[PDB]
Amino acid sequence: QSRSAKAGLTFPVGRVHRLLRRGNYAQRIGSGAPVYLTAVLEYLAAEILELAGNAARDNKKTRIIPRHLQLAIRNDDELNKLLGNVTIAQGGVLPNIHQNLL
Amino acid sequence: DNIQGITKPAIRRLARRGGVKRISGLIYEEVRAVLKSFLESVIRDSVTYTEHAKRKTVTSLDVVYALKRQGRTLYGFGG
Amino acid sequence: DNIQGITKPAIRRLARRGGVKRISGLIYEEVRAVLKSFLESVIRDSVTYTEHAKRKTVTSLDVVYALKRQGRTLYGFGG
Amino acid sequence: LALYEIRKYQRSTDLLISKIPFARLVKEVTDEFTQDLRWQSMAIMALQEASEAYLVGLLEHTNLLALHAKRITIMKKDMQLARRIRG
Amino acid sequence: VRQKRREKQRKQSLKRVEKLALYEIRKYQRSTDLLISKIPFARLVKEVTDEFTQDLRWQSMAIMALQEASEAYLVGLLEHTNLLALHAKRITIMKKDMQLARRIRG
Amino acid sequence: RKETYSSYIYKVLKQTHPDTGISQKSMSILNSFVNDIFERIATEASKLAAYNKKSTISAREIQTAVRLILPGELAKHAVSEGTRAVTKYSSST
DNA sequence: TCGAGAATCCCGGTGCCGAGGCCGCTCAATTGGTCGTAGACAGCTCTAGCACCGCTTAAACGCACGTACGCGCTGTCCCCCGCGTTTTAACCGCCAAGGGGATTACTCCCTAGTCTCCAGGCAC
């Protein structure tokens, strides 16, 4: 019985606890810690995959491309607060012609 | 010369990606100079990474670590 | 009422300290607005720090660590 | 008398903005965000210094933005595009 | 040489089928791929690495990531200088416009 | 043979929206993003642990780190998901 | 005018390379008895912020000369730009050498743990 099947988790909570142990970060890791790490990573993954599913829905393509992920990460102010500095490979840029040139 | 390999219509298409109506003839040399400066500023760290590692291949892991060190992190090539 | 804790000649003398001579009338209200939006994140991060410290008084080391996390490191108040 | 105050406030390397109205302002924002919290005066003067540095950086960024648009008096749009290169 | 025959067939298919500046702005804003010619950029980064080198090798994906990051930084600086250009009542940009954004960022 | 989240990303994709396909480069971008936010929350949790005399990383350290990094709606939904999963874990051992 | 025959629009068949699934598997995930060690609470003090105001006190609020210049209009003037035309090297395919990356590990060498003796270091 793994620690993931004790809470319905899918992200590898035992592996994550192992990388926190043998990963030059801290000394002790509580039992309530890596299930919560698995929880917040699962929430972030569910948010970005739902945004990618919407981006695949409204763009009539049944697959996930990096342009869809770039339009996911750049058209949300919470995602511009979180990851407004990093970029996506082959993601392109935001199509926004300014009003003064129009 | 290899600094003029990125020619005038290349920077024109880059500006049309960035949304410019009309551009001037003084832009291209300063664009190439700031591109050489940014390339030097990332390549110095990216080659000190591969010079410490007893290697001669500038690996993609080394350039994404050097990009993460200098703020502008990429996704997909490690990390 | 503490939203007007700063005054207009104070912003004028701060502009003379920097180099801004001619000031518009909207600049003081926009400075109050950008001060409002600037202090709020660091102060609520210090509230999160004090909640991590589970006390009432906000200690100075929590302020230094909050300004270090925000990217506005201050020298002289810790270490 | 234009160069008088520029050579006065810059050479005097002390603070210029208030302390106790800033204490009232930080009490106001902790009443907005938190429950009253006691505040060390070193933390209040550290917030004062950080606000001063952020403001002088914003004004020294808009200084050349004023002369860029053939102006001298800074405008409200100057505190709308200097934030674009400040995050 | 079946790969050569397939390449000639694809080249023939591209030659037969695939073969007021306001359109290019909205055209190149929805493009996703790279826009810098590859092997002159590789020769340029080979010349840049010759200043800080020894026969240092190069993986191809590293030069691809470098081209992507440099294109991203250039379009970021260009998108930031367009606002300062139109702020100074200039539809046409100038080298003075790419001096303040190169100054106030650091 | 590297410990990759790829099968887990496809698994959590197949629960809410199974109609969308996933490529290779986009999946590697997702894996690098989740590893980046994982190491960011790891170093922030280790930093907050080494701040105020608590070497054991409990749920308190990482909930303070989640409240620290994320914006308000994101930290609210993240602390909701984390409290839900920690009750489901501490209840079912 | 009938009809047979050639051309084309639209409908049906088929490569094809990327997404999806799968058998074999093999160093990690689980649980466990234990065990030195973090750590949470509490008397108790001590110490830093808060209010009132004694006593002054520069400084902001706001209105009045006045002229510098932001915005808009008018004329100027020229420099990138669309377009045509000529050149040119990028991409692709392919032949070829070979060179560092990757994987295995052993003596040796440098470190965790151990106790023992001494010279730093802010307080009086």
DSSP letters spanning A10-50: -S-HHHHHHHHHTSSS-SEE-TTHHHHHHHHHHHHHHHHHH
Residue F52 to residue C55: CA distance in whole angstroms: 12
Distances (CA, A) of D76 to C4, C31, D62: 19, 10, 10
Residue C50 to residue F63: CA distance in whole angstroms: 14
DSSP letter string, chain B: --TT-S-HHHHHHHHHHTT-SB--TTHHHHHHHHHHHHHHHHHHHHHHHHHHTT-SEE-HHHHHHHHHHTS---SSS--
Residue A29 to residue A17: CA distance in whole angstroms: 7
Report how many helices (DSSP H) and strands (DSSP E) chain D contains, helices first. Answer: 4, 0
Distances (CA, A) of D46 to C71, D19, D32, E55, F47: 14, 11, 20, 52, 22
Residue E2 to residue E14: CA distance in whole angstroms: 18
Q: Is A61 exposed, middle or buried (0-12, 13-18, 19+ CB in 10 A)?
A: middle
Q: Name the residue among D54, B9, A24, D43 with its Cα closest to residue C14.
A: D54
**Chain D residues interacting with chain E (CB cutoff of 8 angstroms):** 61, 64-65, 68-70, 77, 81-82, 84-85
Question: Nearest CA of chain E to the CA of D85: how many Å?
Answer: 6
Is F7 at the interface with chain A, CB within 8 A? Answer: no
CA of E27 to C1' of G83 (A): 21
Residue E86 to residue D64: CA distance in whole angstroms: 15
Q: Are F39 and F23 in contact (CB under 8 A)?
A: no
What tokens were used for D50? 């950080």
Q: Are D66 and D78 in contact (CB under 8 A)?
A: yes
Nearest to B2 among E40, E59, E75 (CB): E40
Q: Are A55 and A70 in contact (CB under 8 A)?
A: no
Q: Return the half-sphere exposure (C-beta side, CA atoms, 13 A cut-off) of residue C51.
A: 17
Distances (CA, A) of C3 to D22, D32, D48: 9, 12, 15
Resolved by: cryo-EM
> CB contacts < 8 Å between B and F, how many?
17
Residue A93 to residue B18: CA distance in whole angstroms: 8
8 Å CB contact of F78 and A43: yes
Q: Are A48 and A24 in contact (CB under 8 A)?
A: no
Q: Name the residue among D34, C40, A81 with its Cα closest to residue F74.
A: A81
| Angle between the N-to-C axes of helices C8-18 and C26-52, in degrees from 0 to 180, rounded to the nearest 10 | 90
- Window A:7-46, CB contacts with F under 8 Å: 7-12, 15-16, 19-20, 23, 25-30, 32-33, 35-46
Q: Which residue of chain F comes nearest to B75, CA vs CA?
A: F29
Q: Is D36 exposed, middle or buried (0-12, 13-18, 19+ CB in 10 A)?
A: exposed
Residue E72 to residue E70: CA distance in whole angstroms: 5
**Chain F residues interacting with chain B (CB cutoff of 8 angstroms):** 25, 28-29, 32-33, 35-36, 39
Q: Which residues contact C2 (CB under 8 A, 6 or more apart)?
A: D21, D24, D25, D27, D28
- The dihedral over CA atoms of D44, D49, D50, D55, expressed in degrees to the nearest 10, equals 130
- State the CB neighbour count (10 A cutoff) for residue A81: 15
Q: Which residues contact F49 (CB under 8 A, 6 or more apart)?
A: A26, F55, F56, F57, F61
Residue F74 to residue F82: CA distance in whole angstroms: 12
What tokens were used for B25? 């003839």
8 Å CB contact of F41 and A38: no
Q: Name the residue among B41, B32, B44 with its Cα closest to residue B7.
A: B32
Question: Nearest CA of chain C to the CA of F38: how many Å?
Answer: 17
First to last CA, chain C: 37
**DSSP assigned state of A80:** H
| Beta bridge partners of residue E92, listed in sequence order | B22
Residue C13 to residue B75: CA distance in whole angstroms: 46
Q: Which residues contact E5 (CB under 8 A, 6 or more apart)?
A: none
Give the position of tokens 């209200």. Answer: C29
Q: How far is CA A53 from the centre of its chain?
A: 13
Residues of B in contact with A88 (CB under 8 A): 75-76
Q: Are C56 and C72 in contact (CB under 8 A)?
A: no
- State the CB neighbour count (10 A cutoff) for residue C21: 17
Residues of F in contact with C52 (CB under 8 A): 48, 51-52, 60-61, 64
* Chains with at least 3 CB pairs less than 8 angstroms from chain D: C, E
Residue D26 to residue D17: CA distance in whole angstroms: 14
H or E segment at E49? helix E38-49
Q: Which residue of chain E comes nearest to B55, CA vs CA?
A: E56
Q: Which residues contact A54 (CB under 8 A, 6 or more apart)?
A: none
What sign does the CA torsion over F39, F45, F48, F53 have? negative
**DSSP assigned state of E92:** B
Give the position of tokens 């609520």. Answer: C44
First to last CA, chain F: 31
Nucleotide nearest to F26 (CA to C1'): G19
Q: Which residues contact B31 (CB under 8 A, 6 or more apart)?
A: B6, B11, B14, E74, E98
- The resolution in Å comes to 4.2
Residue B6 to residue E44: CA distance in whole angstroms: 9
Q: Are B69 and B78 in contact (CB under 8 A)?
A: no
What tokens were used for E25? 């702005």
Nucleotide nearest to E9 (CA to C1'): G92
Give the three-state DSSP class for D37.
coil
CA of E31 to C1' of G96 (A): 39
Total count of residues recorded for chain C? 79
Chain breaks in chain D (C to N over 2.5 A) after: 34
> CB contacts < 8 Å between B and E, how many?
145
Q: Is E13 exposed, middle or buried (0-12, 13-18, 19+ CB in 10 A)?
A: exposed
Total count of residues recorded for chain E? 106
